[model samples]
Target: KQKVLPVFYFAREPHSKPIKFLVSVSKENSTASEVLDSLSQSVHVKPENLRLAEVIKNRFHRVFLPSHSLDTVSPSDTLLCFELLSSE
Candidate 1:
């Protein structure tokens, strides 16, 4: 089992404090959607309204489905950040 630390934040407000979680996921191939789904259940939020991202070189890069994996996307002890999708 692989685990990731995800930090959740509002899209409109990046400077706000993030909601953090230490999540366990399959080691094989974990999709961004799957992680988001699990996060939604844990945090009581809608999965469709969220998007996952990775911090690379101090910048946030979006993680797309079928392309990103929890094992490859994030390192242990590093926090993966997610933001709420804007309704606009």
Candidate 2:
């Protein structure tokens, strides 16, 4: 089954709390590229203008390589962390 994934936004500044949001994408057979695109829609960044990774634990912070499946690295109540790579 596929479902939307929860994503955390961590901009350059660590002084502020990481924002949270849901990215609409199929988790079953979705690619990192697709996840990036979906995430961009929810935030102010574009596909290539954002960096994404899986969050395993504190210090275990994790590719998310484009063209590769996003589900390859992690899943099961998935939580992804991302940051803006560009600004308008």
Candidate 3:
């Protein structure tokens, strides 16, 4: 007789904080960071947990324009006119 068995996998997908004027495109047979590195003009966010997975958060500290979303923006342009807040 065969016994019923169950298998489960626990994993979390990396979250992306989209900034203005920035579009992330995964090139053919390329990594995410590689795309960002190729476009050095845009800001690249370093991963905090390098051991687990390569997750990137936008460092919009010194960007030019405001970044609200990833809609209707040219790759050449910079982000501007936005404010961030932290809740306690």
Candidate 4:
């Protein structure tokens, strides 16, 4: 047998018919929560909300690619990281 090091998982779950979410692993590290909290404070949103936003953004980016013909991400196709973070 060989020795093994620690590993992290990128958790995912379906949120709706066409959408999925990346679950947070922040609880595994103390600073993770702090970093998320600070960002929420800066933008005046609850930490919980920010966490969900981050998850959604992660899922959207993972599932889609920008159009080969367009430079900007389409709003309808791309999740708005900032707005979702501030929603709560």
TM-score of each: 0.50, 0.54, 0.20, 0.27
Q: What TM-score does model 4 achieve against the real structure?
A: 0.27
Best by TM-score: 2
Off by over 4 Å in 3: 1-19, 38-40, 43-88
- 8-83, model 1: which lDDT tens digit per residue? 5443333444456556653355344665565555555666545555545454454534534344544543334566
**What lDDT score goes with residue 45 in model 2?**
53
Query: Residue 55 of model 2: what lDDT?
Result: 48
Cα distance off (Å), candidate 2, residue 53? 2.5
Question: lDDT (0-100) at residue 13 of candidate 2?
Answer: 38
Q: Each model's C-alpha lDDT?
A: 0.50, 0.54, 0.26, 0.29
> Which RMSD does model 1 reach against the true structure?
5.7
Q: Evaluated with lDDT, which candidate comes out highest?
A: 2
**Segments of candidate 1 deviating more than 4 angstroms:** 11-18, 26-30, 55-60, 64-80, 85-88
User: In candidate 4, what are the lDDT values of residues 16-60, reduced to their tens digit?
Assistant: 122223222222223334433444444445654433221223334
Q: Quote the lDDT for 68 in model 4.
A: 22
**What is the alpha-carbon RMSD of candidate 4 to the true structure?**
16.1
Model 3 TM-score, 2 decimals: 0.20
Q: After superposing candidate 2, which stretches have Cα over 4 Å from the reference?
A: 11-17, 27-30, 55-61, 69-78
Pick out the ten consecutive residues of candidate 3 with the lowest summed lDDT. 1-10
Collision pairs in model 2: none
